Structures are given as structure tokens and as C-alpha cells.
């Protein structure tokens, strides 16, 4: 019903362990973990003995812990479901304490507990904190409290009680930046679960290494990677103006954007629209929110160049609202702020490091074609549509230059195909038919040029079928089936091909027309997947469409194409779409009356 922006694989972080946080920090700094991060990992793995045995004893005595766990409530007055949820919550809290102990971080507790004050009905919060305190007392009662890790269990229970005592924490807000931009809200649990992103702020009195760290993060934001090791980052005047008391991080972002390094990376190999999307990534930390934002950017580039677009992005209200003056732009993804569903696919394909690997501009295609009806496309995306030439299964690769526009067609949806029957005439399409073009030999050759769009070598000749048809033992339909069951046909159209692409190209060669919808394509794919290649060839030759169109004594021929096929078959444009205006009069040349 509507075109798809892509559903990429996302892994939302529910919490942080100790190793995940350290690796997140080292990764977000683009470096090997250093000696203190090394000491983090090694010290936590050293305490792992005590942590695992704490979790062992707590899981072993969980039944008695939650059995032991203000005005005590009545079972009958509270309700059976509410009593069940009280016991479930209590066992759940103990489980998450053991989870935190093994993970070495209270991030799971703090994320999953801090905003629970009113989720639990808040008239039983005194009962809740008394029960949690009694669980703390009992867990320490059978875990000896002199100087052991019972201090650790006390601290983790205290952190759980402290998180639960925190009242209503305000949801974070990604406010709409324009009339076309929707505002979004964001729970603080989702904010605290999200991966910590370093906020590189450059102040004039920072030490040199901290400044160089901020410069390196600026390179990683803008140029997508660290270029400082290379001699291409020779920008000694911008760096030097940036380091001391002047030329702040915003001016430096602009200087990085207008540099020819940025043009070589993200403007020279791209058309304007893809370049605009990448600039949105590199200067605001987010993709295009809406079509109208892209209209503003595209018109601005059209009359003033791309450097003015960089100037407008870093001079925008949103830039000063998020990154201010001396904060490096950072990527605003899943847990950093609230995400919109509008650009979910394009923006998650843009935040990925393989965003320059795509040339076709993902945002504008999705945003425009959502406000348009369904496109003329094979039901399993446009990569399944081969190139309408005489021969050769030429499909768009999913990896090499991904130009993918996924679209959901219904099962009953049918493709519009441009037939050659209504077009042209008769005795114009009966020159490409080759029934029984009366010589047998010509019919063998034309059956080849249908089955393999060009004449084949002698090793690819199916000479036994030639002798059979010259003797009248088999008819044209059986010969075409034998050619389509030859080994070289399998190599040409079945082995080195995606299976539904293989089925579609065999359908185009054996039927002379693309498939219509998921009925046909689903049936062929199911046949060739549960039964195989020769079964699909037999089912396509014995298909009722083959019998109605090509019968038994007629070589298959192309009958229908995609409209893209005719657009390829008219590079000068179509014949007569509206009467031309040869020798016209325009104002200005007329006004000089």
C-alpha cells in the first residue's frame, strides 16, 4: 500500500555491563582500551569470583528471600492478581539484583527501577520499600557481614532502594524544529539504557592532548574517520586558530565542511541530494526529518553551492540548540534522543558507517514515494527486475551500489506491463514469432535466440533434440523445454543467480513477459524451492500461459515488458507525447516588438 523505507537490524541496549561500557567508551573514542580501562576489565574479572558466588547464593535462597519479603496488606482485600504481581515484582527485584551482581553494574537496576515509584500504585510504596529493606536485611543475614562482599550486596540493595525512591523523572523531549518536524518524547529509562556517547567540548584552557582528542572527534564526526594520522589533515591554520582562545568548534566545523577534503569525500562522488543527506549526518548528527527540510536544502544548494549548505546547517537554530558553540556534533541515534519513525530506515542506513557506500539518495526517494502510489516493480524489490536486453541475466546487486527501494505489494496486486500487441501492428510482431521462418533450421536457431538471447556455441548445442525435431519426433514446445533443461541454460540462468531472480529471468525467457504479482512469483519460487530447476522449467513450459500464447509449435517470443524497458528502448524520448512548439514566441524577444 505504501513504499518501504527499509527495516534495518537494530540492537537496542537494555542496560550496560562492565565490559560493554568499557568497550563502548574505547570504541566511541576510536582507540584500543588504555591501561585504566584495562584495569577496569581485569579488576571486574578479578571480582567475578565473588560476584558469581553472590549470585549463586542469592539464586539458591531466592524462595526464602521472597517468602520473608507500615500496614501489612491483606491477601483477600488486595486481590489475587495484585498479590500475584506483588510476589512477581519481589522475585523480579531479587533476580535483577543478581543480574547486576554478575554484570558488575547497577545500570540494569537503575534503568529498570528509577521510574517505578508510580508504576507500582504508590499507595504501597511504603510497603514496597519495607519489603526491599527486609530483603536487604535477609540477604545480608545469610551472607556474613564483617568485611566481605556483604558490603557489596548492601550497596547494590541500597542502590535499588535509592532508584525506587526517585519520584517522577521528566521524559526527555526532542522538540520539533519546524512546522514540518514532529516533536518527540523520550523516557529517561530509554535515555539511561542508551550507549554513553562522549560529549567533546573544547574550552580555550584545555590541555593539548584533550584539544587533540576533540579535534580527532571532530574528524570522526565530519570526515567519518580519523584523518589526523594522514597528511591530508594538514589544516594547520584552522587547527591553530581553533586551539587558542578564538576560532571555536562551530567555526572549525564550518572550516572542515568547506574544505576540499570534505568535497572529495562526500560531495565529489555524489549527486546533490545524497550529498545533502550526508551533510545532514556530518553537521547535525541526524538525517533528513521531512521532505520540506530537503526542499529548503536543495533550493539553497541550487542557487548558492554546497558550501552555503554547510554554512546554513552549522548556522541553523538546531545546531546551536544541540551543539551550541564549542560542542562537537555527535550522532543522534536510538538512545541518544527520541527517534522518529518517519526516517527510520534511511537514518539507520545513514548512521551506519556504510552510508557512503550508497549513491542513490535514500531520504528523498523514501519521503517522496511515500506520498505516491505503488511503483512498477517486481514484488520482491527492484533487484529482482532484470535488464530488458536481448540476452543476459543482469540484476541490480544488493551490495554493489545499493539502489534499493523496498515496496510491499499485496498477493493479488498485478504489475502493469507494456505489451507489444496493442502497440505496433500485425505483420510487425509476426516477424518475431517463428512458428513450426518456415525452415526447420531457422526455428531451431530462433528457439536458441529465445532460450539464450544470442546464438550459442557448438558445445551448448542440444544436438539430440535437433535430430528429434528434424525427424518430427518432438514438436517445438518439447525442443524449447529441452533447451531450457540443458546444462548451459542452467549455468546461464539458474546457478549464478538469486533464486527468485533466476525464476523471474527464466519466466521472461520462456514466457516472453515479466511476472504480474506475488501469485505467479510465489508459485514459481515455491516450485523451484521444494522441487528444483527442471521442475520449474517443466511447470513454466506446461504453464497455461505458454499454451495460450505459444501453443505447441511456436517458439516463445517477447510479448510484454516493464515500462522501464521501453524507457530504455527510447533514449530520445517517446514518439509524440504532446505537439511540439517549433518556432515559438517568448516574451522579451517578442516585446522588442
Amino acid at each position: 500500500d505504501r513504499t518501504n523505507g527499509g527495516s534495518p537490524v537494530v540492537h537496542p541496549q537494555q542496560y550496560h555491563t562492565v565490559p560493554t561500557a568499557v568497550i563502548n567508551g574505547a570504541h566511541q573514542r576510536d582507540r584500543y582500551p588504555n591501561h585504566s580501562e584495562m584495569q577496569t576489565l581485569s579488576t571486574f574479572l578479578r571480582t567475578g569470583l565473588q560476584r558469581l558466588e553472590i549470585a549463586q547464593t542469592l539464586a539458591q535462597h531466592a524462595n526464602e528471600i521472597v517468602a520473608a519479603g507500615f500496614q501489612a496488606i491483606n491477601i483477600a482485600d488486595y486481590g489475587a492478581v495484585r498479590m500475584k504481581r506483588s510476589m512477581r515484582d519481589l522475585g523480579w527485584f531479587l533476580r535483577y539484583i543478581t543480574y547486576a551482581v554478575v554484570a558488575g553494574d547497577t545500570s540494569i537496576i537503575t534503568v529498570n527501577t528509577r521510574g517505578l515509584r508510580g508504576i507500582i500504585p504508590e499507595d504501597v510504596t511504603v510497603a514496597t520499600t519495607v519489603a526491599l529493606q527486609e530483603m536487604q536485611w535477609k540477604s545480608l543475614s545469610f551472607f556474613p557481614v564483617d568485611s566481605a562482599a556483604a558490603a557489596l550486596v548492601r550497596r547494590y540493595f541500597d542502590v535499588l532502594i535509592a532508584d525506587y525512591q526517585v519520584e517522577k523523572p521528566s521524559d526527555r523531549y526532542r522538540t520539533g524544529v519546524s512546522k514540518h518536524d514532529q516533536g518527540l518524547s523520550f523516557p529517561e529509562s530509554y535515555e539511561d539504557s542508551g550507549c554513553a556517547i562522549p560529549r567533546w567540548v573544547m574550552k580555550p584552557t584545555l590541555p593539548d592532548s584533550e584539544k587533540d582528542a576533540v579535534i580527532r572527534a571532530a574528524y570522526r564526526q565530519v570526515f567519518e574517520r580519523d584523518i589526523s594520522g594522514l597528511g591530508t589533515a594538514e589544516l594547520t591554520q584552522p587547527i591553530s586558530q581553533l586551539k587558542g582562545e578564538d576560532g571555536s568548534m562551530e567555526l572549525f566545523i564550518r572550516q572542515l565542511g568547506k574544505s576540499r577534503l570534505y568535497r572529495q569525500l562526500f560531495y565529489e562522488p555524489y549527486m546533490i541530494s545524497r550529498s545533502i543527506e550526508l551533510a545532514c549526518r556530518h553537521f547535525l548528527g541526524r538525517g533528513l526529518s521531512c521532505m520540506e527540510e530537503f526542499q529548503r536544502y536543495f533550493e539553497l544548494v541550487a542557487d548558492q553551492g554546497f558550501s552555503a549548505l554547510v554554512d546554513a546547517l552549522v548556522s541553523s537554530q538546531e545546531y546551536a540548540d544541540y551543539f551550541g558553540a564549542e560542542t562537537v556534533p555527535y550522532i543522534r541515534g536510538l538512545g541518544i534522543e527520541a527517534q522518529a519513525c518517519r526516517n527510520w530506515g534511511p537514518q539507520l542506513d545513514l548512521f551506519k558507517y556504510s552510508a557512503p557506500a550508497r549513491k542513490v539518495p535514500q531520504f528523498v526517494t523514501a519521503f517522496a514515494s511515500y506520498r505516491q502510489p505503488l511503483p512498477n516493480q517486481h514484488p520482491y524489490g527492484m533487484g529482482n527486475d532484470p535488464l530488458e536486453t536481448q540476452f543476459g541475466a543482469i540484476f541490480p546487486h544488493e551490495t554493489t551500489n545499493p539502489a534499493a527501494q523496498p515496496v510491499h505489494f499485496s498477493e493479488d496486486s498485478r504489475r502493469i506491463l507494456v505489451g507489444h500487441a496493442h502497440r505496433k501492428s500485425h505483420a510487425e510482431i509476426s516477424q518475431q514469432i517463428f512458428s513450426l521462418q518456415h525452415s526447420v533450421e531457422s526455428v531451431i536457431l530462433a528457439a536458441y535466440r529465445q532460450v539464450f538471447g544470442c546464438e550459442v556455441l557448438g558445445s551448448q548445442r542440444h544436438q539430440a533434440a535437433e535430430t528429434q525435431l528434424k525427424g518430427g519426433l518432438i514438436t517445438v514446445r518439447e525442443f524449447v523445454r529441452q533447451l531450457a533443461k540443458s546444462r548451459s541454460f542452467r549455468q546461464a540462468y539458474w546457478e549464478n543467480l538469486y533464486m527468485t531472480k533466476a525464476a523471474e529471468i527464466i519466466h521472461r525467457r520462456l514466457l516472453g513477459r515479466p511476472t504480474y504479482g506475488r501469485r505467479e512469483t510465489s508459485k514459481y519460487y515455491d516450485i523451484c524451492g521444494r522441487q528444483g530447476f527442471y521442475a520449474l522449467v517443466d511447470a513454466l513450459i506446461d504453464s497455461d500461459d505458454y499454451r495460450t500464447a505459444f501453443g505447441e509449435n511456436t517458439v516463445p517470443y517477447e510479448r510484454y515488458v516493464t515500462p522501464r524497458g521501453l524507457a530504455l528502448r527510447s533514449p530520445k524520448g517517446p514518439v509524440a507525447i504532446s505537439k511540439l512548439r517549433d518556432n515559438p514566441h517568448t516574451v522579451g524577444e517578442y516585446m522588442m516588438r
Partner: protein, 167 residues
């Protein structure tokens, strides 16, 4: 685009002036606008109750979502689901004011299925909770005194239809 601007844009794209059918439809929308504003007011006064109680009713009828396998188990995911409920209620109220689903088209259905398939969010509990929200706003509108509950029926049904699958 509300009903007015959508109908005007359609006639602009075909080049016609306003015929009497458009004048009748515009006057009908302008008459229903008092009820639409009343429902928007009740919604703005009871939105947290409506969205949260719909989430609670959904988790009672679909029990698995708060169970450990479900994609609303922890309170992080629970709060995310309730915030989604508030999202649906707010944009359905926007569409109720406008009388048109363009707001839903560009700001609710613009990739919701892609997000819910990326995160593993189940589609059908989401539309079941949307229907619980619709029945809730229907019943407190009927108690408030609005006989015509037809207007408040449409945005939740549109979100459900565009989000749900084909059986």
C-alpha cells in the same frame, strides 16, 4: 492537511472551482468542528489516563507482553510502550481536530512498521491497544454527551488499517 485543505488541494490539482458538493462537505465539517474540539478538550484533560489504562487493559488481555518473553517486559520497555500509546493518542487527537488522516499519514504511518520490525515490537498488540484507546474515548465521549461518536472512530481505525497485516 485537514478536510478543508485536502479537498481544496484536490480541486486545485484538477482545476475546478468549488462546486456545491464541496460547499456542503465543508459546511458539514465546520458543523462537526464543535464536537471535534470538545473531544480534543476531553482528550487533553484525560490523555494520561486513557493511554495508560489502554496499555493496562491490553496487558491484561494480552498477558505475554509483560511476561519475560514479551517486548514490553521490563519497565524500560513498559514506559516505551506507554509513550507510544501517548504518541498514538496525541496524533489521533490531532487528526480528530483536523478531521483528516494526513497528520497520521506523514507522522504516524511514515515507517512505523519498519521501526516495529526492527525492534521486534509486535504489531497486533499495538493495534489492539489502539482499539482499546478508541473504545475508551468513545465511551467517555458518550458519557460527556456527544451522540456522534463517528468522528472519533476514524483515526484509530486508520492507524490500525495501515499498520496491520493482511490475513
Amino acid at each position: 492537511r485537514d478536510t478543508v485543505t485536502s479537498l481544496i488541494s484536490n480541486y486545485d490539482t484538477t482545476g475546478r472551482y468549488l462546486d456545491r458538493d464541496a460547499i456542503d462537505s465543508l459546511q458539514s465539517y465546520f458543523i462537526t468542528g464543535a464536537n471535534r474540539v470538545k473531544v480534543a478538550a476531553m482528550i487533553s484533560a484525560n490523555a494520561a489516563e486513557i493511554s495508560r489504562e489502554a496499555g493496562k487493559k491490553l496487558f491484561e488481555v494480552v498477558p505475554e507482553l509483560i511476561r519475560p518473553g514479551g517486548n514490553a517486559y521490563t519497565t524500560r520497555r513498559y514506559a516505551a510502550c506507554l509513550r507510544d500509546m501517548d504518541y498514538y493518542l496525541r496524533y489521533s487527537s490531532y487528526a480528530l481536530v483536523a478531521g483528516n488522516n494526513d497528520v497520521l499519514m506523514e507522522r504516524v504511518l511514515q515507517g512505523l512498521r519498519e521501526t516495529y520490525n526492527s525492534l521486534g515490537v509486535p504489531i497486533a498488540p499495538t493495534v489492539q491497544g489502539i482499539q482499546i484507546m478508541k473504545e475508551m474515548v468513545k465511551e467517555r465521549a458518550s458519557d460527556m454527551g456527544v451522540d456522534d461518536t463517528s468522528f472519533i472512530d476514524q483515526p484509530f481505525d486508520f492507524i490500525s488499517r495501515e499498520v496491520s497485516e493482511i490475513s
